[PDB]
Amino acid sequence: SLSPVLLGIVWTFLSCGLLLILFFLAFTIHCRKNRIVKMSSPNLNIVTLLGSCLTYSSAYLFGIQDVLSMETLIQTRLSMLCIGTSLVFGPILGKSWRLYKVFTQRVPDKRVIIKDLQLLGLVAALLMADVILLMTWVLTDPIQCLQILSVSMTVTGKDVSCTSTSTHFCASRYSDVWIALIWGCKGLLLLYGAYLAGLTGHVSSPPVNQSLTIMVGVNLLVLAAGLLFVVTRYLHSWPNLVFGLTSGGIFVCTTTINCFIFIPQLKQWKAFEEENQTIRRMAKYF
Amino acid sequence: SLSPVLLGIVWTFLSCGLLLILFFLAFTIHCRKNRIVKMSSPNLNIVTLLGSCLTYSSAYLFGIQDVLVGSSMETLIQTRLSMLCIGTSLVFGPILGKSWRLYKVFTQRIKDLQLLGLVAALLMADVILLMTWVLTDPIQCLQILSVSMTVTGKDVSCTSTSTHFCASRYSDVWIALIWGCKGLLLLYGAYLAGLTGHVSSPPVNQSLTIMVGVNLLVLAAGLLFVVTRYLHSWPNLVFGLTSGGIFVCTTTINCFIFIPQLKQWKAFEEENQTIRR
Amino acid sequence: SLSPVLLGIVWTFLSCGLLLILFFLAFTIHCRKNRIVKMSSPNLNIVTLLGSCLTYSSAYLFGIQDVSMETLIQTRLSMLCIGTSLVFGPILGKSWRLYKVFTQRIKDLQLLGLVAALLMADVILLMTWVLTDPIQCLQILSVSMTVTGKDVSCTSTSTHFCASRYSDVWIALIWGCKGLLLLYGAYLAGLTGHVSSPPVNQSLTIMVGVNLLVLAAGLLFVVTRYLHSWPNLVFGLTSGGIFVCTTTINCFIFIPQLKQWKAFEEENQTIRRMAKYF
Amino acid sequence: SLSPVLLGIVWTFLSCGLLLILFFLAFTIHCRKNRIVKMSSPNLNIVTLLGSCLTYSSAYLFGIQDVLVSMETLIQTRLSMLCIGTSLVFGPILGKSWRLYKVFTQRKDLQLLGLVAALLMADVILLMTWVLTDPIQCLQILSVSMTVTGKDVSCTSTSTHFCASRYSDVWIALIWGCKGLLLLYGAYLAGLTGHVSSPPVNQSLTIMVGVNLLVLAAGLLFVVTRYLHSWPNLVFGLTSGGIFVCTTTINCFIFIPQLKQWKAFEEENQTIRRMAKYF
Numbered sequence A: 001s002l003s004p005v006l007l008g009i010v011w012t013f014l015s016c017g018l019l020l021i022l023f024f025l026a027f028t029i030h031c032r033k034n035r036i037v038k039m040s041s042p043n044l045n046i047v048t049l050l051g052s053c054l055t056y057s058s059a060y061l062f063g064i065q066d067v068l069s070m071e072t073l074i075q076t077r078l079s080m081l082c083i084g085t086s087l088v089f090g091p092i093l094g095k096s097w098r099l100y101k102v103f104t105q106r107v108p109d110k111r112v113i114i115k116d117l118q119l120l121g122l123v124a125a126l127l128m129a130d131v132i133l134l135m136t137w138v139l140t141d142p143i144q145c146l147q148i149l150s151v152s153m154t155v156t157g158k159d160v161s162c163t164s165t166s167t168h169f170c171a172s173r174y175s176d177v178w179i180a181l182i183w184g185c186k187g188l189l190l191l192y193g194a195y196l197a198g199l200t201g202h203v204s205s206p207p208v209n210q211s212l213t214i215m216v217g218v219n220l221l222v223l224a225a226g227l228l229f230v231v232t233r234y235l236h237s238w239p240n241l242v243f244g245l246t247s248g249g250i251f252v253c254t255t256t257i258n259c260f261i262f263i264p265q266l267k268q269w270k271a272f273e274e275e276n277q278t279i280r281r282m283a284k285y286f
Numbered sequence B: 001s002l003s004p005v006l007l008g009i010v011w012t013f014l015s016c017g018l019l020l021i022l023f024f025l026a027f028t029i030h031c032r033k034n035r036i037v038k039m040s041s042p043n044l045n046i047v048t049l050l051g052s053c054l055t056y057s058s059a060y061l062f063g064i065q066d067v068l069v070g071s072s073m074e075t076l077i078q079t080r081l082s083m084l085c086i087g088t089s090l091v092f093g094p095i096l097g098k099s100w101r102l103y104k105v106f107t108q109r110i111k112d113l114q115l116l117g118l119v120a121a122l123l124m125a126d127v128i129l130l131m132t133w134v135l136t137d138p139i140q141c142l143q144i145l146s147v148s149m150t151v152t153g154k155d156v157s158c159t160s161t162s163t164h165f166c167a168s169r170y171s172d173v174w175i176a177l178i179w180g181c182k183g184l185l186l187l188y189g190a191y192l193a194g195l196t197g198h199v200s201s202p203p204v205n206q207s208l209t210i211m212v213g214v215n216l217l218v219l220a221a222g223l224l225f226v227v228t229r230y231l232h233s234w235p236n237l238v239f240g241l242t243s244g245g246i247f248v249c250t251t252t253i254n255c256f257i258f259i260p261q262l263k264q265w266k267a268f269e270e271e272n273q274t275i276r277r
Numbered sequence C: 001s002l003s004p005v006l007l008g009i010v011w012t013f014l015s016c017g018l019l020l021i022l023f024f025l026a027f028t029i030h031c032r033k034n035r036i037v038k039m040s041s042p043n044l045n046i047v048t049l050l051g052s053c054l055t056y057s058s059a060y061l062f063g064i065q066d067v068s069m070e071t072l073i074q075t076r077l078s079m080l081c082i083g084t085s086l087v088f089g090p091i092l093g094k095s096w097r098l099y100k101v102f103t104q105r106i107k108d109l110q111l112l113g114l115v116a117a118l119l120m121a122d123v124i125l126l127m128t129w130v131l132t133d134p135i136q137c138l139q140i141l142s143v144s145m146t147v148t149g150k151d152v153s154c155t156s157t158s159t160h161f162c163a164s165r166y167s168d169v170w171i172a173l174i175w176g177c178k179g180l181l182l183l184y185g186a187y188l189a190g191l192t193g194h195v196s197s198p199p200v201n202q203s204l205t206i207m208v209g210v211n212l213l214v215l216a217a218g219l220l221f222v223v224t225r226y227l228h229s230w231p232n233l234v235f236g237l238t239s240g241g242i243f244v245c246t247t248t249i250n251c252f253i254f255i256p257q258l259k260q261w262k263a264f265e266e267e268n269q270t271i272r273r274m275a276k277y278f
Numbered sequence D: 001s002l003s004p005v006l007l008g009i010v011w012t013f014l015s016c017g018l019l020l021i022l023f024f025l026a027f028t029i030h031c032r033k034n035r036i037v038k039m040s041s042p043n044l045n046i047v048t049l050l051g052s053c054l055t056y057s058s059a060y061l062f063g064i065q066d067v068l069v070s071m072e073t074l075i076q077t078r079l080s081m082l083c084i085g086t087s088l089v090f091g092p093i094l095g096k097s098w099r100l101y102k103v104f105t106q107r108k109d110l111q112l113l114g115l116v117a118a119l120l121m122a123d124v125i126l127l128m129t130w131v132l133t134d135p136i137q138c139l140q141i142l143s144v145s146m147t148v149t150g151k152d153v154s155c156t157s158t159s160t161h162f163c164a165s166r167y168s169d170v171w172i173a174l175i176w177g178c179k180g181l182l183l184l185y186g187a188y189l190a191g192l193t194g195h196v197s198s199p200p201v202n203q204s205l206t207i208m209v210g211v212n213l214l215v216l217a218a219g220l221l222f223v224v225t226r227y228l229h230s231w232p233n234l235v236f237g238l239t240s241g242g243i244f245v246c247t248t249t250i251n252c253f254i255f256i257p258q259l260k261q262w263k264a265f266e267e268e269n270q271t272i273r274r275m276a277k278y279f
């Protein structure tokens, strides 16, 4: 079905990205008490990294074809993408909202319980929205792999033509409804994320400020989703191209998001440790 | 197939919206030199007014069936969709330009010419996409009658459907292109609205207008995409929903732009009258 | 020459102020690790409370009259200068750190080093004041014949005062350096204006403190210079000005922390009550 | 009395500064409708320049000595001119900063003129109270003082003639105090508008430089006037130099960016005009 060379290349790239995510997770857990890591949100960074792992896993699953049960495979690979995107992007919006609310306090500080509940609601409520949409899609209009043989007798204003096509595709009866819903909810939450990124545009440094990561992420996500919807819909007779493009889009988006989140943490951690070592040796020498 | 009552109600609502648009245009052209109107960029508002009237015109065009005088339904669909696209571009360009100017003035301080040039570039992108859509494949209407046997691996069903629709061969690709470029524009507009957050008063600060407009645009566009895709056997429902969405979005955006200007103008003039006496 | 009643009232007020300062010190030492206290730089608040203690001690020292007197006056004036520098340094450091983290991002050691340089400026000025010319007390008796060009008047005055030969130069120096510091502090308070909550944003406290500081310094300079034949008035006004300024600044620093802490632990207690109920 | 060379040099420098103020006034009035000038506050800049003129005029008066043998009113008017000139220089800048802060924090020249009118009325009532209650008197006193320490005794013979007020330090502390409170609020305003716009519109740097230079100059000149009355040339030169430096620095910081951004605008206009002529 799919060429072994493309499968090997995609598997290698996905495994390398997964190893990078594991290294970031190890850095976050081990250096959790460090000032550079602590001034970030390591507990939210964990959720982002689990979402990244889910996205890479779904990218792996996209390569299985003509093996399985196929309806459940498509349903679970797509649900994994949706939940992974929610888990990747919710924490970043929560961090931006926290940074915005910290630096715009007033006399009516409200209550810390309400602030914590709103922070939890900018993540868990989004995840629950995706969960209920996926449950409604699965229970109401599940993906069905059906084969149609059909003869079509179309006619234009003056020309008559006849076609006879047989195809084997897996999709829902009302697939565009669920597409418009999930695309729509993600787009509204990402518009609010862009608003939050703008509101906190120059409020702190890239390790704490998350405006650039949000903007790059939303733009890349819109581009990748727009491309992949179209190529999956129309270039269904190009299995290698569709698989490679889907894996590449998922890989690029996840890797760019995580690199933008974590590379500055590593840079400032190295700088802080170098400063500490310099002062330690200067004190020891004297 | 369109009920006269729905047509009458929709026409009256769109006419009232157009009269509101013309009132705002007269207000912003007559009272150009006033401080309240002048500080809100009266020249850039003309483009928004023209885009709004173009969108209302497209909403009118959505309500006629068959042919005008022996004409082509293809041309009607193409022209109303392109009118809607150009109108939304012209509505949302000036607001983003005003927000960008406010941001740049706030941060290490832009004439109207540069903003109009950026809006013109946006319009050129939309025009290029519309032109390549029209030339690469038109929206030709086809009569599709066919018989298909469905084999799910457990049951066999035969159906005979005679369907007529006006669409492109690859219509989802053009949908993806137009929606995607508009969505990138809206993402940058939301970023700009956040950047100019609580930077001035609402007459000068066009930040709530952007956030209301982008959300209304996304919601209406998704709803109407789905409804047109699937509920094509409900011409009255499709027409009413499309006209209602266009009217609601355009009127909300224009009111959010112009009600602060009008009330601040009234307050300023009343204060001047009190001072003079 | 000072009434016992005024002495007792002033000492009771200063002792209550010291008790309040010690209560704030206990609160900020015990509740070091709390979020509300930790986000308000508990290490830089110790320096402010120490400076407040020095200022209250100098206010106490202002009330003893007879017994050398030069060492007493120099001691209390230098204590006041050191205490006010220690009070106002940490607030400026906190505002500077808030500005730096807000504007494209500072350890406590760097801020304490800046405060140490600020203190060293005052130490240098006080040392050169004490060594160049001390505050020796002289009994001056003289006969003066005034000729204004239209009338002739004669007066004989026997006056005693403790001052330096060039006292206004040292005044203008100390006042000038403190005023430059206060102007930069007001600039910092403006920069970090409506940037965070009161316990973190030390902006109203800076403005109130500098305004009260200028007012009290001007009033007490004039009163000491001219109303020297009113010992009770001078003592009461000096002690009251010191007490009012110090107490106002420290209350503005610490009362927001106390109420936010009370709200925080009230919320925690409600959470624990809900957990126990289920 | 005073050396002719120092008098000539000080008069030359003050005249050059006054001509610079006149040039700035001509530029402000002539190009009052220009966009760069209009987005500034030319009506308030006129008040600043008039205050600068008063401050430059008082420096000339500080050089008149041993001529009006009349000397009390000369000192009173030269000092009142300084106080009013400082008020008129610094009030408009604070008003511009406050207007900029209020425009960009929302939920007009007449109002700012009223505010600076109140600011000047404060100085007017202080100066009137000083003149009416405790005016300057030029008095000559001869006296002998028997200074005795704890163990040492000495006698001195002093005969001096100085023009000063009886409670001079009271009025000093008052005027210094009110000015210092206004300068503290001005520094607060400069902080509030720290990075709100460009230097032509933003006035934070000019405010901070002005308040620092003003405090430093006033502190120096108080001490040298008090303790170096036997150095007439030194005190005259230092007072004139401080006044000149403060006024010139403040006015340059206000107006040089306007000239820069006006010349750049005119150059752009000329370039586009030439391009239009080409096509």
Ligand SMILES: CCCCCC/C=C/CCCCCCCC(=O)OC[C@H](COP(=O)([O-])OCC[N+](C)(C)C)OC(=O)CCCCCCCCCCCCCCCCC
Residues within 6 Å of the ligand: A055, A074, A078, A079, A081, A082, A084, A085, A088, A143, A169, A170, A171, A172, A175, A176, A178, A179, A182, A183, A186, A187, A188, A190, A221, A222, A224, A225, A228, A229, A232, A233, A246, A249, A250, A253, A254, A257
């Ligand atoms: C941070 C990293 C994560 C981001 C990765 C972005 C990559 C997305 C690629 C997956 C999307 C293309 C696949 C479409 C569905 C498909 O395979 O067809 C089966 C079918 C549709 O098939 P079909 O319609 O494409 O082909 C049949 C054509 N026919 C003519 C018959 C209709 O899927 C569905 O029925 C819809 C299920 C929706 C579930 C959610 C999809 C996954 C969500 C992941 C993106 C969400 C986040 C981004 C949103 C956008 C930004 C606001």
Ligand SMILES: CCCCCC/C=C/CCCCCCCC(=O)OC[C@H](COP(=O)([O-])OCC[N+](C)(C)C)OC(=O)CCCCCCCCCCCCCCCCC
Residues within 6 Å of the ligand: B055, B081, B082, B084, B085, B088, B091, B139, B165, B166, B167, B168, B170, B171, B172, B174, B175, B178, B179, B180, B182, B183, B186, B217, B218, B220, B221, B222, B224, B225, B228, B229, B242, B245, B246, B249, B250, B253
């Ligand atoms: C501020 C006011 C502006 C907001 C108004 C929002 C209202 C939109 C309603 C019109 C859109 C639905 C109609 C879709 C096309 C149609 O009718 O079918 C003909 C066809 C599609 O037909 P079809 O697919 O819908 O039905 C046939 C089904 N079949 C199975 C055969 C495929 O149109 C096209 O081919 C695509 C043309 C693209 C041109 C652009 C459309 C106008 C753009 C206006 C919105 C852009 C701005 C907002 C975007 C959202 C934010 C990112």
Ligand SMILES: CCCCCC/C=C/CCCCCCCC(=O)OC[C@H](COP(=O)([O-])OCC[N+](C)(C)C)OC(=O)CCCCCCCCCCCCCCCCC
Residues within 6 Å of the ligand: C055, C077, C078, C080, C081, C084, C087, C135, C161, C162, C163, C164, C166, C167, C168, C170, C171, C174, C175, C176, C178, C179, C180, C182, C213, C214, C216, C217, C220, C221, C224, C225, C238, C241, C242, C245, C246, C249
């Ligand atoms: C936060 C709490 C701190 C604020 C408390 C404010 C209270 C200040 C009261 C003390 C100042 C008045 C006493 C003056 C000296 C005196 O007593 O006479 C002895 C003498 C002067 O005597 P005399 O000149 O006043 O009387 C003699 C008159 N005769 C005619 C002879 C000249 O002292 C000196 O010689 C100068 C000593 C300078 C040392 C520094 C003084 C203490 C500084 C404390 C304030 C600094 C911070 C604020 C600065 C202002 C804002 C920028």
Ligand SMILES: CCCCCC/C=C/CCCCCCCC(=O)OC[C@H](COP(=O)([O-])OCC[N+](C)(C)C)OC(=O)CCCCCCCCCCCCCCCCC
Residues within 6 Å of the ligand: D055, D075, D079, D080, D082, D083, D085, D086, D089, D162, D163, D164, D165, D167, D168, D169, D171, D172, D175, D176, D177, D179, D180, D181, D183, D214, D215, D217, D218, D221, D222, D225, D226, D239, D242, D243, D246, D247, D250
């Ligand atoms: C922006 C441009 C303006 C800035 C120019 C700054 C320069 C100031 C120099 C003038 C001040 C020194 C002269 C003092 C008075 C004098 O000459 O002696 C006669 C006398 C004092 O004499 P004497 O005490 O110096 O000498 C006699 C000594 N004896 C022992 C006898 C007392 O003046 C007075 O009586 C007081 C009158 C007060 C009127 C106001 C003075 C002018 C105000 C100008 C500055 C205001 C703005 C800055 C304020 C500070 C910042 C917050």
